[PDB]
């Protein structure tokens, strides 16, 4: 198995990393688009909400495309930003 870096599909192995700027876990990607880890997947990956672990390997599951409708939001992106929210489970 190899780590996907863009165009994420169900079942892809991915590297989930702590993004300091957004203080949220995101998928490691070469895409300009943000792929945020769904908050419900934190326990699935043994991660804590916000010392935090810098990365973990996971497997892509459900994915949703989103747009920020408010200027200040939980993803810490500007108003109008389009991004993904991805669920993931532990590898193996």
Author numbering: 1494 to 1543, 1550 to 1591
Could you give the paper's own sentences about this structure?
We also determined the crystal structure of the isolated Claw domain without the adjacent coiled-coil and obtained higher resolution diffraction from this material. Crystals of the isolated Claw diffracted to 1.56 Å, permitting a precise characterization of side-chain conformations and ions and waters of solvation. The isolated Claw crystallized with a monomer in the asymmetric unit; however, the unit cell contains a crystallographic 2-fold-related molecule that interacts through interface-1. Three sulfate ions from the crystallization medium were bound to the isolated Claw monomer at a location distal to the dimer interface-1 but overlapping with the putative FIR binding pocket. These sites are of interest as sulfates ions of crystallization often serve as markers of biologically relevant phosphate binding sites. Sulfate 1 is coordinated by the main chain amide and the side-chain hydroxyl of S1532 and the guanidino groups of R1573 and R1584. Sulfate 2 is also coordinated by the side chains of R1573 and R1584. Sulfate 3 is coordinated by both the main-chain NH and side chain of R1573 and is near the side chain of K1569. As compared to the structure of the CTR, which does not contain bound sulfate ions, R1573 moves by about 4 Å to engage the ions, while other residues in the pocket only move minimally. The proximity of these three sulfates was suggestive of a potential binding site for a tris-phosphorylated peptide segment, such as perhaps the tri-phosphorylated S365-S370 segment of p62.
The formation of autophagosomes requires the hierarchical action of a number of conserved factors, including the upstream-acting ULK1 complex containing the scaffold protein FIP200 and the downstream-acting conjugation machinery, which catalyzes the conjugation of the ubiquitin-like ATG8 proteins to the head group of phosphatidylethanolamine on the isolation membrane. Crystal structure determination shows that the FIP200 CTR contains a dimeric globular domain that we designated the “Claw” for its shape. The interaction of p62 with FIP200 is mediated by a positively charged pocket in the Claw, enhanced by p62 phosphorylation, mutually exclusive with the binding of p62 to LC3B, and it promotes degradation of ubiquitinated cargo by autophagy. The Claw is constituted of a six stranded, mostly antiparallel β sheet and a short α-helix.
